[PDB]
Ligand binder design. Structure first.
Ligand SMILES: *C(NC1(P(=O)([O-])O)CC1)c1c(COP(=O)(O)O)cnc(C)c1O
Ligand SMILES: *C(NC1(P(=O)([O-])O)CC1)c1c(COP(=O)(O)O)cnc(C)c1O
Ligand SMILES: *C(NC1(P(=O)([O-])O)CC1)c1c(COP(=O)(O)O)cnc(C)c1O
Ligand SMILES: *[C@H](NC1(P(=O)([O-])O)CC1)c1c(COP(=O)(O)O)cnc(C)c1O
Lengths: 328, 331, 338, 329
């Protein structure tokens, strides 16, 4: 394949670091070596995260097209909209965000802390409810909007970012002098796992990318990942077809609903935070973290396996679930 | 000087990057070139920040002495206490925090969001004083069978507490080498003092100690200024600075600290928004929003020589934003 | 029947008023005439409510046994614990409250507004337990009572809602009494009565009281517990124990206890879209507010009933407003735009 | 005087009850007999309060003029705006409220709990910010006819009637009680509450016995408003006398530090009063008038044997906006 064909606008510090989770690894039995690739610490633009790696491939088209306003959408505690708001300010562009009530949750400060709060400070026009109305709104005002779908996923360039991710991992394995056996990643809108599948199919490891569902609608998410992997594979000239076998999506850790954690989620967030000083959230990472932990605990990983946990970000959202953590 | 003499436990990713703030620079008139050194993005341990750089030099002593528990203190939204609980967890050490009511502020979720929230998740035993707690906590650890390492507010009034930022100066010189030029000034928020202290010492090494413009956030200028000078001198002796820190070496602007510690004025808010909206770089209403305020105001007043290159140190503190949600409800 | 046998300590202002809900009635078709008996406005003791009516009969005992501390229990936004705390300060007694989280709910200011906020200002010792503690499993109840004694005081035990307590059903039999006296003036009788039911003695007392004139099965209870079976049984149990206590010249039949299960979802403490619509409609047509936990659900019940035609044309339904409005503060996000 | 001249639309349950605060009284020395008139429990309309008594005399005009919308104003945690939203709903009228930030305070749920939350549930159109004129005009431009209700109903012709009536009630109740109250403590900010009391008690020569406790932190301005509204009101009811400045007593000692912000004494008073009587007061108004009355008794400023009547004007729901301050009681 050839990813180099597509321009990348630098929004990050550079390749994200990989750290050993020795204490957690040891706590679970010392039979599986866990690591963490810090996608959550990739930028100075409002904490960044996985959506920021993605945006590096969309920005060029935005500029090439001469757009002056970035428009995106997501739930109230959306990490994506927050990142787009930061990226926007950094580039000198206006920003319109559609924030929808995607979660059956009602916290008193849910629409005033964490991610949404930062977006308002960052100067974005935050519209709480729509998509087309926002876009049209921009034209009618005399500006040219660049449409960024949820999580940047269902977009032509939306999976390029994480194809690069697999690239980076190969380069880093070279340095470490060893290859990771699996990769755990959280999936919801899909292009994160999609890009990984494509990139890792390149070396025969697409099926080693273990996606954990956090949408609680595994069928849709699975299909979207598959569809985007297929479009992205073509885009980058993957010398192969993405098969259903190439898309692994665990469905055991998404409950009870999207945006709502279960007792295991909370326990996972605590264990990880208490053994490594590494925080995860109640919506996404706490769920992928829970999945990985549970997998090791079940013996689902071959002894001696090196698993690379991809921490995609999302911590600011912790502020929207304050009461659940009042005593830790 | 010789800083390499003291061991440093890795808690950060490595040197913190310097980024130009061209939009904000241009916004103000294009006469002063503004930059930022991101100490706020120095670690994967619960967002880190300036206190984390400092802790790199206290930990080795904590481990050497075989302590099994880190104990510290700060106000409700303290950044220090959170970093201490992250570092603790990472190190396999227990953690006890004394959170006090240092701010005349009363937000509904003040003690349940931001920094303190993370601390509890991190496993620290977070103790809220009513409404001697310090020695009470230290002893509670001993009486429990452990050995506590005492970390004073901000790590500031501690022998090793200023080493962290002498190294900061070290880092900037090496970076100036690559950049091929030297920064004319540096802006740093100051409250308990060893951050500025370390900078004054480290920059005194090349005669730029007076170029470090401290911006007070304690609203108690005199005390803070004094503590900075005292920690600077103690530290200078610790590293073998080939000079003595003069009172003139400690600069501290008292204009942007109001109205009180932990409370922002309208300038602070304006500053926060302006920087946020022009660079996508967030700052808090307690510390950084004030230093940013000071810098912006300095540039706007022509107090900086035209053509000057001013390096703003972003110390962190953004999570505290959650404790002031209403003020930012409409942005 | 003889209720006058038991002493009643004044905690209320006196009989609670009945007001016509003319706009709501007209809005629903004008075919059923809805009224409301304001138990929610029965006292100066921290907003009172149905639980304050019941306490009038328990206090005399607590004082006669010379208890110096009232001890009770309830969820975080329990109305019961708040009224106990007020009544207690008013009488010069100490107060210990065991509060656990009985609701799968997690609002940022849940344990610091509304009812619990008042109990703390009222001087009660509010004992909360972190999630997973299980007061029911550990027995925070008995630990509280013992702690009071160990401290040198004498506690008077008041169970959840006063319901499963010998004197607990007395209060609302008096309610039926009041309603007949008031019906005399009105020159007519209410065909039904809608009341919200959770721990039981409110409807229970009403059943006893109204059985005395053959209207027991006219008391339509709406379940807000989401555990209709247990609730129904406790009502029936409390009603029988209470009937015997007041000398009801009858046996309470399974048919005398009506409990509608259609408006309790999805869980105790959690409202449905219907609950919210009922709250807003009643509020916007009468200036009368109800909560997401209790009243909003009975109100939903009554409205849904009228709209369904389950009420005979011309019927006059008497809605008992038990109180609980303060709990609204625990559900701010839900009402952020109305 | 003749108050019966003006029509009063029933919005309350009837005369408000008076209760003895025997515990509080004994706690403070037992040398002064404290009582309370529960204006805070006057109506089934969203908790009511003193503003509801005032509204009883404005509604007739509103209806007589055929207005279909009630428009009022006040701070975020305004009691008045809540009471107007409830009254409107009850009357079948639309409601528009101008909520302004009159308090230097910034709690996370300040604009989502207590009074303002109820107003939104009651169906009023709650506008957070010429704001006043803009609302009135938007109503007209919409095809409706708005009835303008100024802050607290105070600077309004009919605004002072409601509490002249309060004095009437007290006289009637003193009759039954077989005795008269020597003083009356009332909280004052916009003014028509104490103003009306001054007029109505002027009738029996007790106007200087109505002790107003300022909660505005701008006593001069508040004192002048009371005096001003009292005079205009006295003329409207035909008081057989003119209201002198000595007729208006306003203590400035307990309004600090600002309007809407309580001091340590406020909090203490709120607790002492709640813990001895089971009667709650808020940190904006009543907690300050309560603070005042307690400090007065504790300082001996009341002659031994006096019977002081505390007017509880309401406002408890505002408590929800100051949650952190009471987290531990
Ligand atoms: C340090 N602020 C602390 P805390 O909020 O407790 O962690 C100590 C009060 C701090 C400073 C000031 O640094 P000093 O070395 O002068 O104490 C500036 N900026 C941020 C983000 C801080 O956390
Ligand atoms: C009583 N609800 C209580 P609490 O939440 O502790 O105050 C007991 C659970 C209550 C009810 C139901 O009355 P019961 O006699 O059936 O328990 C209905 N409405 C309101 C407002 C209550 O407080
Ligand atoms: C009235 N306070 C108001 P609001 O907060 O808008 O309802 C007007 C500012 C009020 C007062 C003071 O009465 P005045 O007649 O002097 O305005 C005292 N107590 C309570 C509970 C009020 O709501
Ligand atoms: C992305 N989550 C988003 P948002 O909350 O809007 O920013 C998109 C729903 C996200 C994911 C999942 O990534 P996908 O490519 O599968 O959508 C995982 N982890 C974090 C922290 C996210 O923010």
């Amino acid at each position: 394949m050839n990813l180099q064909r597509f321009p990348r606008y630098p929004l990050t510090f550079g390749p994200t670091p990989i750290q050993p989770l020795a204490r957690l690894s040891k706590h679970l039995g010392g039979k599986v070596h866990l690591y963490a690739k810090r996608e959550d610490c990739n930028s100075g633009l409002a904490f960044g995260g996985n959506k920021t790696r993605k945006l590096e491939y969309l920005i060029p088209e935005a500029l090439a097209q001469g757009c002056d306003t970035l428009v995106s959408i997501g739930g109230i505690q959306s990490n994506q909209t927050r990142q787009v708001a930061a990226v926007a300010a950094h580039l000198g562009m206006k920003c319109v965000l559609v924030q929808e009530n995607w979660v059956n949750y009602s916290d008193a400060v849910y629409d005033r802390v964490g991610n949404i709060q930062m977006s308002r400070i960052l100067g974005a026009d935050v519209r709480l409810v729509s998509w087309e109305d926002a876009l049209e709104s921009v034209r009618a005002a005399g500006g040219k909007p660049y449409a960024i779908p949820a999580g940047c996923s269902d977009h032509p360039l939306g999976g390029l970012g994480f194809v690069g991710f697999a690239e980076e991992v190969r380069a880093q394995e070279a340095e470490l002098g060893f290859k990771f056996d699996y990769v755990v990643v959280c999936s919801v809108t899909g292009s994160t796992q999609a890009g990984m599948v494509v990139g890792f199919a390149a070396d025969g490891r697409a099926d080693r990318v273990i996606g954990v569902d956090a949408s609680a609608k595994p069928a849709q998410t699975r299909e979207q990942i598959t569809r985007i992997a297929r479009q992205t594979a073509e885009k980058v000239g993957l010398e192969r077809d993405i098969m259903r076998a190439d898309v692994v999506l665990d469905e055991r850790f998404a409950g009870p609903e999207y945006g709502l954690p279960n007792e295991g989620t909370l326990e996972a967030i605590r264990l990880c935070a208490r053994t490594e000083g590494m925080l995860t959230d109640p919506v996404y990472e706490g769920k992928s973290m829970h999945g990985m932990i549970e997998m090791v605990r079940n013996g689902e990983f071959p002894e001696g396996s090196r698993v690379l946990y991809a921490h995609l970000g999302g911590v600011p959202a912790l502020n929207g679930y304050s009461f659940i953590f009042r005593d830790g």
